[PDB]
Design a protein around this ligand. Sequence first.
Ligand SMILES: OC[C@H]1O[C@H](O[C@@H]2[C@@H](CO)O[C@H](F)C(F)(F)[C@H]2O)[C@H](O)[C@@H](O)[C@@H]1O
Ligand SMILES: OC[C@H]1O[C@H](O[C@@H]2[C@@H](CO)O[C@H](F)C(F)(F)[C@H]2O)[C@H](O)[C@@H](O)[C@@H]1O
Lengths: 649, 649
Amino acid sequence: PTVVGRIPVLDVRPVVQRGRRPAKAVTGESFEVSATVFREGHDAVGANVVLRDPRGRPGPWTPMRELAPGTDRWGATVTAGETGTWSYTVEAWGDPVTTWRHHARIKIPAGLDTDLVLEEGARLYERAAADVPGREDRRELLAAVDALRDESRPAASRLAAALTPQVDAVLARHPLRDLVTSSDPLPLLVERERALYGAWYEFFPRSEGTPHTPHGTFRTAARRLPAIAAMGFDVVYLPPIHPIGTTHRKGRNNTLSATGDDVGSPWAIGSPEGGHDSIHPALGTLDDFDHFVTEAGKLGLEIALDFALQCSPDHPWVHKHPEWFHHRPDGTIAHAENPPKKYQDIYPIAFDADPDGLATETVRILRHWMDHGVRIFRVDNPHTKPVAFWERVIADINGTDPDVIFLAEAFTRPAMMATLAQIGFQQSYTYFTWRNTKQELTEYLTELSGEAASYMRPNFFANTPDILHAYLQHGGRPAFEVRAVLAATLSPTWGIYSGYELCENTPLREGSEEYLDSEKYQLKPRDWTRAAREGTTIAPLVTRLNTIRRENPALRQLRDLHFHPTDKEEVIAYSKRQGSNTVLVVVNLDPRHTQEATVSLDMPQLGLDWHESVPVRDELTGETYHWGRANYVRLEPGRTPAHVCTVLR
Amino acid sequence: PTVVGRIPVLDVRPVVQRGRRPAKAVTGESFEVSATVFREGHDAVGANVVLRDPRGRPGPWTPMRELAPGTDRWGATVTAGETGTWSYTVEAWGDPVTTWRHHARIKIPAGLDTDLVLEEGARLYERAAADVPGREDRRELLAAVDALRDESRPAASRLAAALTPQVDAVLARHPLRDLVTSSDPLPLLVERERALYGAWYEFFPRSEGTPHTPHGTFRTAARRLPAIAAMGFDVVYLPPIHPIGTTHRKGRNNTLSATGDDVGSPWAIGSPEGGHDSIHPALGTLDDFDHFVTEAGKLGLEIALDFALQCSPDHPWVHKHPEWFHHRPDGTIAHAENPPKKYQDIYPIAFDADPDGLATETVRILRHWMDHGVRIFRVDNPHTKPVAFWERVIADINGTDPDVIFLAEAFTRPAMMATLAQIGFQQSYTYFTWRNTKQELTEYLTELSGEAASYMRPNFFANTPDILHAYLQHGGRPAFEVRAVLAATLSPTWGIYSGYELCENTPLREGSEEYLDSEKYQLKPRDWTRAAREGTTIAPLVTRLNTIRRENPALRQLRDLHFHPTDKEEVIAYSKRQGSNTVLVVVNLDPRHTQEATVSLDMPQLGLDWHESVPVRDELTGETYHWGRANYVRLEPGRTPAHVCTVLR
Ligand SMILES: OC[C@H]1O[C@H](O[C@@H]2[C@@H](CO)O[C@H](F)C(F)(F)[C@H]2O)[C@H](O)[C@@H](O)[C@@H]1O
Ligand SMILES: OC[C@H]1O[C@H](O[C@@H]2[C@@H](CO)O[C@H](F)C(F)(F)[C@H]2O)[C@H](O)[C@@H](O)[C@@H]1O
């Protein structure tokens, strides 16, 4: 038994961990299946992709083409349908009809062995007709056969009868395939739309309180939900909603000792009041939570809860399950770290004394919140827990509830980030916030939209409670507008942390990416009404970007992305396409100076000829333009961060 | 059962077709095994390579190192021993001692609960001691344990006692490994030295005849062997030695009609005198062949026979096995092509009617010649036969006779060239002859010496009966000198086709790569004795190159090769290393003009400091130099084509 088949079909992609983990897609998402296909001798090959659904049913006829001359690399686009575990194969084959046509087209005008050549053509078309199911199609081919054999017609006429468009149509759909050879099937995990596409909004319920009761509840925080939905978001992500420890509770601005009314960090989970399956008593009850979830649902918002597998020193687990922690010789548990950051208010979990107990309890907790309508979890720092632990937990949860989405908050080295996605995380945080120059952005998104897209779905948060980039610090509102445009148009999933709209950008100190008076350690009431009235919010820009995304399919996918040359380092241009929808974006990365540039569009990449010019509408302003191979732009920060254009019919 | 283990160890390389074919080596050859290794959290990892021989026996302790900071890619060099099928795995582990040392070196000077840190180190060293077999090593570690625990001593000195070199030595030999995780085993095929290293000489026995009998015999051809051994060759490759057909026999200079005593192409195999298992009547008998093989052995020369699976029209197979050929509707068999080259004198084989019969007869023929001492086969145009056919044939033969070496003469596209090597071919012809500028050679050898070396062993023929490159045509003798130096020093296997050393360079016509009056179609008597007497031969240079290769282990391997910058386009520099042997080569690629250049060596790549300088000897001349960071060279065509220097010790 040979490893290589009759007609070699090798190195089928996409592939994850040599086939041990599935490649990823979502419903309706297109992606390219490719392979290395060739044969011995000089005759032609063909190839096609067979995508099988969870019941094993093959999809449509999907012929491949060679992707570049001389490479023997073949590819075709396939589209994922319903959710579940799919599989795909590549089939390679001798293509004798293409070979014969190429030869016949030369030998017949030349008068070389024309009777022999034409009879050879007849015998091929006969064999082709054998595997054709439709009688009318069979007759079309038999007609070509009989004309090929009609020795009373001129040679050129006999040949032309075999090359009609009606003949071609039958053969494109039902080619004569010699020596059909398959690859072994590769697995494909198809998940719901929201795993790839969605806009995310993060906020702290406790900050949305009242004059008499500053600490918000689920009842009072539910009042933010309409504004969040009105901005076009689809997911609300909440920091931990559990009780917060008192022992070593942190004070305002990440100081070591809390005083008086200090609320502590939500990530210091657990107290006598309860742990990960409990509600912070100042937020209300489980019933209040259900109400909040119902109200979010009515507005088209899904809740994403923070899952942080760690404990305050006051968490029940500390005495109920001591072996879930590493104890030093004197009995103490060292507080967690993420150097040079220190987390004195929490203990990390130890996994090697009782991995089964931890896993059982972890999925019990997740299933608790799932029963209260939470189908998305934002997983805090998963790279500090064992990789195989997440693999097991996610397979367990998705085994009964495949719609549950896990988002990996792993800001770490590339190997770990990729692995966490590959072992099951539906979504990943990225390096987005640390990619701000044109080169950084171009390089990173080429990586994300390239091969990584077969296992990773990026969630572009333009800020988070722990990340205020110096770009925003130094650039002010024009920088906030640029990052929102970039995040919203470069990834099918993006997000902001509340306060981004107001352009909050005062850091803890120079050189830090922490906010001053961080909301992690104090209530932060914000005057939303005033900001709206005084126009000191970019909420209208955020709203518009999400509307443009909702209306343009090209912006709801990841893999089709192309960067176009510009003659200015500060100006970046790119396009994305999905079917007949084409979006073209031009961004001035300079938040402080006006930039004019020439944008030289890669026209064949837009599916246009170099001479052509197309109508475009800038969806940020309503202005229309006619663009071609080279277009002038002038972008004034404060007035215009970018052009976000749809190509018009 | 999770796909990732406790400590992630991923993407072990080398790997060939995802583990379905083995990576390759030869006895004594070193190469890097690598993997992606990391863990959760911030603690240290360690890794090591377990190389197992054909009987399952593990090699010595082989710890890996991270190859580049922040990449989590780890590697180690291993060395292949005896021939057979080996396996390798990578083991990954938590390295608690490295972790503890790093923490202790910081915390002890700062006075941060030092009693606790030191008691944690004592318990680690206690664990580490329990496993060490050596009783002297054990008491050394437990001595450090006691020092660590002596509370009556200063903290710094308690720690310092755990960091002594004699403690380091023990733990380098027997580290404490936590949570040991292993990759799945990958296969390694180890083959004999000749598969990677050897110098080849191609000649036609019929051309080495006599005045009274111009058509050479095996007995007269044997008298040519001493001069071939004296040039330092190891392998003598003979074109087909079988009867040659008369039907459509080609005439001199590849004319379509043979006349009179035209001997025809040896590749037009078969007549009623016999086929692939027979000897051409004019060469003699099988006994004569045996004499020729015996004489070759006496001189340290192995025979490589040409295997060409194709037939003249007079081959007995044509009527005995008509289904081994593709017939046209009129019953005729179209002659072979390799467009636009036409081979009117032969029929190609068809494989899909009786593949079992063809495979069976093929290995029978090979085994016949193997019984007569032929353990190397040069396989003619394997890419016009099914890839799976060769995979089967090569597995069948190497199954009983693993020492047999197959060389693929596949001048074709890269995917097929690579696949043929991957499915079993021990050696491959290459694009070498069409790589003549510094960039071409640099790029091509970077490819060959990189990842491809895990499955492909290159045989650098500077010429063949079908390839007289324009570089040789225009450059004359000095060009022949350059190509010999390049071929012999860039690859551990190289070869020439006879007449190369006489600098035969007259093309069939301008822009052709065929020789005028090609030996493929006529007897080519060469007056070797006169060429030697008159010095009109570069045989002494060839002899010198082969002696240099025999005396310098660096030139007998492929993977270690580094190119060094020079400030002249026409001058190329490179180095190769194997243990303490280093060879530095500088070549003037201009065969018509003298070239002066500055050669800026990458001293770190030579294992030297940037300021340092080292004694070298140019093994072509005997002249000694002192070379360092930047060296002047002056290379003069016909006098000094190159420097071939060994670094002196
Ligand atoms: O309360 C513990 C810890 O909470 C925050 O740190 C978070 C950290 C630990 O869970 O994990 C991620 F990095 C995060 F969620 F992004 C952080 O917010 C506070 O920053 C930290 O000071 C506090 O000690
Ligand atoms: O005798 C047939 C054929 O022999 C030579 O061609 C060889 C070819 C066909 O076997 O395969 C390789 F490419 C080779 F061995 F390198 C060729 O020498 C002659 O060139 C050709 O003219 C002749 O018809």
